[PDB]
Design a protein around this nucleic acid. Structure first.
Ligand SMILES: C/C=C\C=C\[C@@H]1O[C@](O)([C@H](CC)C(=O)NC/C=C/C=C(\C)[C@@H](OC)[C@@H](C)[C@@H]2O[C@H](/C=C/C=C/C=C(\C)C(=O)c3c(O)cc[nH]c3=O)[C@H](O)[C@@H]2O)[C@H](O)[C@H](O)C1(C)C
Ligand SMILES: Nc1nc2c(ncn2[C@@H]2O[C@H](COP(=O)(O)OP(=O)(O)NP(=O)(O)O)[C@@H](O)[C@H]2O)c(=O)[nH]1
Ligand SMILES: OC[C@H]1O[C@@](CO)(O[C@H]2O[C@H](CO)[C@@H](O)[C@H](O)[C@H]2O)[C@@H](O)[C@@H]1O
Ligand SMILES: [Mg+2]
Length: 393
RNA sequence: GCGGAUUUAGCUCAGUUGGGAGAGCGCCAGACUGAAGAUCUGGAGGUCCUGUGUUCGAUCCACAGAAUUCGCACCA
């Protein structure tokens, strides 16, 4: 691309989660179109956010989609998540790399299944801040109903351990705004206003080696194969050398581009979801889950001893013990992989709540350094949290 | 990113929509012939692709995965 994208303001990437059918995907367009005037950016519409045909006919958002917009004191990378239960896995990854998250909730219904699920999955993945947004207020005029719901969204949040009280809550309507009624456009800003007031500023690594967990791959007709993702740390000056590590046989490549939302760039510093060019690599040779990095700073692995805390039921985990052979999915950065457990001579079972040292063996090698944290989800819910104590590979 | 379909002995394939699995061939024997092969007669041989949940009990259900494949989408 030939634009340029010139730095200014810190770059905070955020997004939308929350129950289905109420807000998320339309609020996104709103923010982008509102702000494309109240701060003059460049907006897009629903038709453009849920661009995928299945999303159009099914009317439901299946895969996250990225979108950008500018405030005056920050830069925003926005990711729209799918509320449908069938896709949590899809949003999990999107949220996992979020600086803060707008939890959209409809005034009318209020807390629903997919709303608890997301908030919990939030708290469980990284995400440090949530800004609740009561939506569809243009469907409820009973200043006392809102009181009721808000008073219950909070109680919820703070149940998974969030601020809740100190938690900001805008009151507006997406399509209203998106359409034009300025009495609401204003509300879009009262939110777009807290993404700065509340952030607060993200610490970026930079003082370390390059590494970017891949999370999406494209094949630009004009250029070559592209991979996107949130730079974990360091920087990649275009023209540098990279290694596509893990899952498949390690591959060597040289950067050949680094865009930031269709706008050319020369580098990509920690915290910016950006694209890369990697020359010589075709689409069918690289995939999500793999990490791009400074050659020789990270090798792939299969077997490793770990120290894991198996959450209890009271934390939404198993309620029945597991034994040798249990093989759930271990989540590493931008993916997961089934690996098998092997308990210690001198341990026959693991009860939810217990802590355990167990040696895992994934069905696929993965970029991992001793100490790397990972999560374990199985048959639908997060089974436990742990860390790579000692690689054995 | 989203959907279908198939996985049952070494090979080819039936079977059960929860009660604890077969044929043929090929494999190991005794039988006939100097012996091959044919063929007769006997046995051995399955984690029913994997893990969980439910259950008194799961090869079949549920929830999570794998390998083949066959279609769709998307495009810094
Ligand atoms: C979560 C998915 C992928 C995670 C991947 C990786 O996780 C991580 O490894 C992470 C590191 C700790 C990890 O391992 N996460 C893995 C796990 C981490 C878990 C941590 C921290 C917890 O403490 C024990 C923490 C949430 C704790 O739980 C409490 C939750 C109680 C819930 C009760 C729910 C109950 C009865 C319930 O019926 C219920 C519900 O209400 C809503 C939805 N459904 C339910 O069924 C409370 O909210 C506390 O806050 C890193 O973040 C990595 O970088 C990562 C993001 C790549
Ligand atoms: N009255 C009213 N309707 C709204 C409002 N916001 C969205 N809607 C409508 O309700 C539906 C919700 O669509 P959408 O925003 O994509 O839902 P979502 O929250 O992203 N759910 P999912 O992404 O899981 O499909 C649409 O028909 C939309 O136009 C609002 O504030 N008021
Ligand atoms: O073409 C718009 C594009 O410009 C960038 C940098 O290339 O930012 C500039 O324009 C924004 C819109 O008003 C300003 O908020 C920003 O301060 C200014 O540098 C991109 O951020 C934007 O996508
Ligand atoms: Mg949507």
């Amino acid at each position: 691309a030939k634009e340029k994208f010139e730095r200014t303001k810190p770059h905070v990437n955020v997004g939308t989660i929350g129950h289905v059918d109420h807000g998320k995907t339309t609020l996104t367009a709103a923010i982008t179109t509102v702000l494309a005037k109240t701060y003059g950016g460049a907006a897009r519409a629903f038709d453009q956010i849920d661009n995928a045909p299945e999303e159009k006919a099914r009317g439901i958002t299946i895969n996250t989609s990225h979108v950008e917009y500018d405030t005056p004191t920050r830069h925003y990378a926005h990711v729209d998540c799918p509320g449908h239960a069938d896709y949590v896995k899809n949003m999990i990854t999107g949220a996992a790399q979020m600086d803060g998250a707008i939890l959209v909730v409809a005034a009318t219904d209020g807390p629903m299944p997919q709303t608890r699920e997301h908030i919990l999955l939030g708290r469980q993945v990284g995400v440090p801040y949530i800004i609740v947004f009561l939506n569809k207020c243009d469907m409820v005029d009973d200043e006392e109903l809102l009181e009721l719901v808000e008073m219950e969204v909070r109680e919820l949040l703070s149940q998974y351990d969030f601020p809740g009280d100190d938690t900001p809550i805008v009151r507006g309507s997406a399509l209203k705004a998106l359409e034009g009624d300025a009495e609401w456009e204003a509300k879009i800003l009262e939110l777009a206003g807290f993404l700065d007031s509340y952030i607060p500023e993200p610490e970026r690594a930079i003082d370390k080696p390059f590494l970017l967990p891949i999370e999406d791959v494209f094949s630009i007709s004009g250029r070559g194969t592209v991979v996107t993702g949130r730079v974990e740390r360091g920087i990649i000056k275009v023209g540098e050398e990279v290694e596509i590590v893990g899952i498949k046989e390690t591959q060597k490549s040289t950067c050949t581009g680094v865009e930031m939302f269709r706008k050319l760039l020369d580098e990509g510093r920690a915290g910016e979801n950006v694209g890369v060019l990697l020359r010589g690599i075709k689409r069918e040779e690289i995939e999500r889950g793999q990490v791009l990095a400074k050659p020789g700073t990270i090798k792939p692995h299969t077997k490793f001893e770990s120290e894991v805390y198996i959450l209890s039921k009271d934390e939404g985990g198993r309620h029945t013990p597991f034994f040798k052979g249990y093989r759930p999915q271990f989540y590493f950065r931008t993916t997961d992989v089934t690996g098998t457990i092997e308990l210690p001579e001198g341990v026959e079972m693991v009860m939810p709540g217990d802590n355990i040292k167990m040696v895992v063996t994934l069905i696929h090698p993965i970029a991992m350094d001793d100490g790397l944290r990972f999560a374990i989800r199985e048959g639908g819910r997060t089974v436990g949290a742990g860390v790579v104590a000692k690689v054995l590979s």
